[PDB]
Amino acid sequence: ISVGEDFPSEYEQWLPVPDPESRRRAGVLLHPTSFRGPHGIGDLGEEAFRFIDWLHSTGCSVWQVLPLVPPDEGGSPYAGQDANCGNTLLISLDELVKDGLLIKDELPQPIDADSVNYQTANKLKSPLITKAAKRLIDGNGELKSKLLDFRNDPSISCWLEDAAYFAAIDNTLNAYSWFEWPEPLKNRHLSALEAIYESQKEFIDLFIAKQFLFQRQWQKVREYARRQGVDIMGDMPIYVGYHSADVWANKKHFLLNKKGFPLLVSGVPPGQLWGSPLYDWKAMESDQYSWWVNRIRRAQDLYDECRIDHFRGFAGFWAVPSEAKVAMVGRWKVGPGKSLFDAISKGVGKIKIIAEDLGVITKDVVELRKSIGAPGMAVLQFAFGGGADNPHLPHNHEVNQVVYSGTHDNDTIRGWWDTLDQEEKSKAMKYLSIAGEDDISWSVIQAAFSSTAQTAIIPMQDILGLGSSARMNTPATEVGNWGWRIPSSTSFDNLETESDRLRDLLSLYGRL
Amino acid sequence: ISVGEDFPSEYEQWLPVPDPESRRRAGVLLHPTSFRGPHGIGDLGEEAFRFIDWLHSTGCSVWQVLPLVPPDEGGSPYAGQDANCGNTLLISLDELVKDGLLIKDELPQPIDADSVNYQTANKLKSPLITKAAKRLIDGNGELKSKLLDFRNDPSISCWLEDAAYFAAIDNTLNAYSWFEWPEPLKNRHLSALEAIYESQKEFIDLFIAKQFLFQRQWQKVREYARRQGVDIMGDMPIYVGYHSADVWANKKHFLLNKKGFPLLVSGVPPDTGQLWGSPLYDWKAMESDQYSWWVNRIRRAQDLYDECRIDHFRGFAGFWAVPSEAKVAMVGRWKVGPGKSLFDAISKGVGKIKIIAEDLGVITKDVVELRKSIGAPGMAVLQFAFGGGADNPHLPHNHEVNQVVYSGTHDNDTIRGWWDTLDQEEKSKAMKYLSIAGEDDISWSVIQAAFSSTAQTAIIPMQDILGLGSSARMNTPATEVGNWGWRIPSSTSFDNLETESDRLRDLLSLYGRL
């Protein structure tokens, strides 16, 4: 331990050791609504456990889902009805039979499983979920006791009670938004809230019970994933909906006017007017960002890791006067920056956050992302426009990054290939290793696996080699999204070939 | 500049900007001895300038050479005769004509040399280099004046005078090494040195003049490379030869005994071992004068090159030391090297440096840590990537940005030759990772994998661009004969390599290395 002197006996064994936090891996993007089954939509029953087995058999160690919130009427998990609740339509009816909350003969006749129609699924399943929730509350055994534990839990009630009351009042009143509610409900006068509890007690207890059932079923999926070596990566939009408990029960955390209407709403310039209310970050700074801390605590309860959509909003955000009809007349505002993430980590511990950072982004975004150690994204479908500086080209990938073939907002690789621009196609053929065009999804999968990016994620549609009809979402259309389901005859038992082929790629590129 | 407040008007223009220090690039490994021409060996004349034009036409921005020192009798640039001098056999005779130091009709008749024979080259060129050097010293114009500037320059003379005297004494005395010299020469008694100057003055002045001529020609190549957008990457072995001015004129900087013989010599352990037999540095001693010897060595490397690789870089963190009596390497111990304090001293003395770490083989965690602490890139070599498993660091998916990727180096066979003798297990593995067409084009498959890497710098040997087989291998380690001789085929001019240039350029454009 001194210049010129002898080193100890075993110097040549002092070899470099790979950092375990740098381990290369792969995963599949599959939302549970796409699982097969008889009730109009996928669920957290037997298909979720079979998927986990299949995924593990491939050597993948990550399962990514879309947000698990209650979606809008079109099915969108990004315009959810609450930021912290689970989508009750994902509750398995068959799992309720095993709990004794339904009996086998109460299960409905199967319906055709081509695509999720959310109206059909709700009509079919909700009466029975309600019925099961009713039996749960009227019992007084182990299960009822676990409901009480759930309900009385401080880290459940800080979002659950607000969510239940909001939903009771929305049920009782015929109003567009809570801005049109009568004043003592609009502004949460204590006695009105007690009058809501009394007059809507049964709806409130059932809402809570249903959230318990979702939690139960999701936590068993998550425990089985952990046993099989699978991390689950969730998703959350940066902004929440105006008509929600999140805003209604925390008005001072948002930029509302004295009458509770948003002064400013979200979007991006030339433009796109998303119309979500905006956070009062200065205000949140006061109480050490407790709202956002809570949101992450719940994300952590649901997921091992979590992507945040429009992450750039944490450094700077586009703000449009709520009167406006289009986005072009806004200004950029300063975001909370790292101090937000300091507060989170102090409140909840070490977090694994993924930054959605697509499109044009400014230097503060990159700097913020890097300062908290969060990986960004590369999407191979975006790599062949422009020149060789395109950051989605594999030679421009980074280690701390998630590479996708595409996301739920893109066509499948097959579909994209079919409509691809001639200029972009010839470029793609130079860079990728392409055999037959039927196998084009595997060419792209292989490029993703061959990247230096630490994490490679592939949508289930591309593993199945499906075309445009299996596209999950097309942005800026309002109908025909969120509907894709795995073809009814394609069981996980019948996907050994695909599993073996993935495993071979993972092994070749050091992702096992 | 406050949370919730407005950003200025032009926020969306505050876009990320590529750091120029991160620019991806490519280059060719070609030693100047390999250039074509009539005088038995390549030189710093017309072919060096034509190569630079060709290289620039490919879009490459780096030229890597082997060390430019006076080689051993076998031609090895790694067992050189001096660490700081240039190989005078690289001097272009035709460039001397343009200086007026030779006249046109004094140029010799062409000879055939499909490969460098060093003895033939020396016999043909040296009389004329000597003659030019003589005319230089007998003149008294601009050129003579530039020689004086060169000679009197403090950063030349700290190595040049020692190098000239050493060589004069070696010339005059019939001795194996300087260890067998008579005592006052061995130990550099001042009066003996003055007696050497007076009795060997002509040899000393001509030695200095020849070093001036090499410097002149090398600096003209280096200026033309700079004008065409080409950086030149040199090479330096970590250790120097015992029989040299480097050791003789600096004994206190090496681990010698009282009679000036090495106590310990270089090598590496088993995996008997490898006994290189070079003398070792007295790092604690060098610490005392702030590593002035190494600072000077780098100052000279900087004068010759934009960037420099250092062979056996691991030696700076730990080195294998064998008792000089020994017949094999197995009976040594590992010793602690200077670490970053050496590089602190360098940077303080010479400024910002661009060093490449040769870091091949088994290396310890202190090596990686040292390399990373000074920001030096290491190496990946694609020919080593297909043994073992998917954690092999030479596989492209395990490459790093701050790294130099090669197809192979001068110590490896060409890609074609390597492919021919490749193990069946390794070949099938290679065919799964690489994109291979016909075996005649295997060098381009490997070139393309190199260019596709995230490594910032990709370097290809000229032999692989020409798609040549094992006969064009530059060096085979642990053979002593038939190395260093490769030359570009006499009929393959740079004018005839537009197809290859276009094909390289297309790969560089596809992978963002232009």
Numbering used by the authors:
A (entry chain A): 59 to 328, 335 to 576
B (entry chain B): 59 to 329, 334 to 576
Excerpt from the paper describing this PDB structure:
Because only glucose and maltose are exportable to the cytosol, further enzymatic activity is required to prevent the build-up of maltotriose in the chloroplast. This role is fulfilled by disproportionating enzyme 1 (DPE1),4 which is the plant plastidial isoform of 4-α-glucanotransferase (EC 2.4.1.25) that is found in all kingdoms of life, although it is referred to as amylomaltase in bacteria. Data from a number of plants show that DPE1 enzymes preferentially use maltotriose as a substrate, transferring a maltosyl unit from one molecule to another to generate glucose, which is exportable, and maltopentaose, which can be attacked further by β-amylase or starch phosphorylase. AtDPE1 forms a homodimer with a deep, long, and open-ended active site canyon contained within each subunit. The canyon is divided into donor and acceptor sites with the catalytic residues at their junction; a number of loops around the active site adopt different conformations dependent on the occupancy of these sites.
Each protomer contains the canonical (βα)8 barrel fold expected at the core of a GH77 family enzyme. In the LF structure, the central portion of the gate is disordered. In all cases, when the acceptor site is vacant, the end of the gate is disordered. The conformation of the brace is essentially unchanged between the LF and MA3 structures.
